[model samples]
Target: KVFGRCELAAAMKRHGLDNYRGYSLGNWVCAAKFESNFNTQATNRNTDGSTDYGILQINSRWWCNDGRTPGSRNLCNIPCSALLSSDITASVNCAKKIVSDGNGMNAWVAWRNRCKGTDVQAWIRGCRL
Candidate 1:
């Protein structure tokens, strides 16, 4: 199942992202909210025609893509389909790699646009973390 906000917060804590990549849990939660509406199956076509995969809306241009797609770097070494699955283990691992590659949360446009510079406490309000 897709993670609820609290579930995601707890998951982030478990995964060592309670304060991941120089950001707090709340910001990441906000990022999750805007990226795919926390839907595991969410996928969208960007204006540039590239596809964003999974809840993080990871892009096909440089991260992960199915082989059928051209011009992909597949830096995460995962198939796009895997990201869309409810299990986000691989997806989160890939995200960590992406963050290490010098982007951090800036890799996501949604984080920049919607998850930045706000009071993000509510995103993790009820989480045990």
Candidate 2:
């Protein structure tokens, strides 16, 4: 990854994400860490057979696409691979739309399982944002 957790935290703040979609930056940080470890190139499979993409772990079921088989809703109208990059532009846009659709950070199972109500602010430790 191009940035560490703290740096990624600062980057998120720079992206005006301190408090967007009614979620706190700390919460986002916690989710990102649990979801991707701040690695933009992150990808994983959900038990339901959908794939998660990027630092926010957006799902193919609604956010992006894989291929001709098992096509997605592609709500963000992006390629799933677009989420897997050092440039977070594509992922950030998809994440915003996902949360706005009411999932917030909870759209990511990782957030629910690992980050919820747990030391989230610690995710930004030493970040000079």
Candidate 3:
């Protein structure tokens, strides 16, 4: 499911992305836009030989276990496939874990490169939180 921008914002809010780890909902929305364009089924294979899954592009190497990543610690203890679901609850939960794991939103390169230190409010324009 490719979520519309505001729609994605609402969903993220429901999953508690708003101000989670001190980053605003706009920060999350912006990262989601640049990360996977809010596509629930999105996947990206990293040059490090691990795959990123779902809207936040949670990685297979350290987070979700794809069962194929070498030395995967499966820190989130979730199968990588769970991140691809249209229901983003699991993905959001893992994302929260990533944030609380001392990485914060900087866990995502896309967020650091695109969402950090920007006018992220535009990403959620017209969306009522």
Candidate 4:
């Protein structure tokens, strides 16, 4: 499921992503755009022998168990496959855990490079719940 900007914003807000650790809804929406282009099933393999899964790109090494990543801790206690679902609930939950783990929104380098320290309001300018 690939979401449009406003649609993804609405879904993230529905899941309580608005300011969930000092990161605004715009930050979340912008990160998703840069991270996965709002595609629910998107994934990427890192150079560190781990994979990033889903729209928010939760990491396999620390957050999810992919059964393939080296030394996966699965601290989020979810299968990596869960993150790829269209429902996005697990992805959102894992992302919240990532932020709460003291990483904040900086967990994704895409966010730091693209969404951070910038006016992200345009990412959700005309969106409505």
lDDT per residue (tens digit) for residues 42-73 in model 1: 88887776788887888888888766557668
- What is the model-wide C-alpha lDDT for candidate 4? 0.89
- Model 1 TM: 0.90
Encode model 2's per-residue lDDT on 11-97: one tens digit a residue.
Answer: 777777778876777888888887887888887887778988788888888878886327558889988998888877777777788
The clash count of every prediction, one per candidate, is 0, 0, 0, 0
Candidate 2 wrong stretches, greater than 4 Å: 68-71
> What lDDT is reached at residue 10 by model 4?
87
TM-score for each predicted model, relative to the true structure: 0.90, 0.89, 0.96, 0.96
* lDDT sort, best first: 3, 4, 1, 2
The TM-score measured for candidate 4 stands at: 0.96
Model 3 clash pairs are none
Q: Model 1 lDDT vs. the true structure? A: 0.80
RMSD per model, one decimal: 1.5, 1.7, 0.9, 0.9
Cα lDDT of model 2 overall? Answer: 0.79
- Tens-digit lDDT string for candidate 3 (87-124): 99999999999999987888899899888899999888
Worst 10 residues of 4 by lDDT: 96-105
Error of 3 at 48 (Å): 2.1
Report the lDDT tens digits of candidate 4 across residue range 1-129: 999999889889988998888788999999999999999899999999999988988889899998998767999898999999988789888898888887688889999999899999989898886
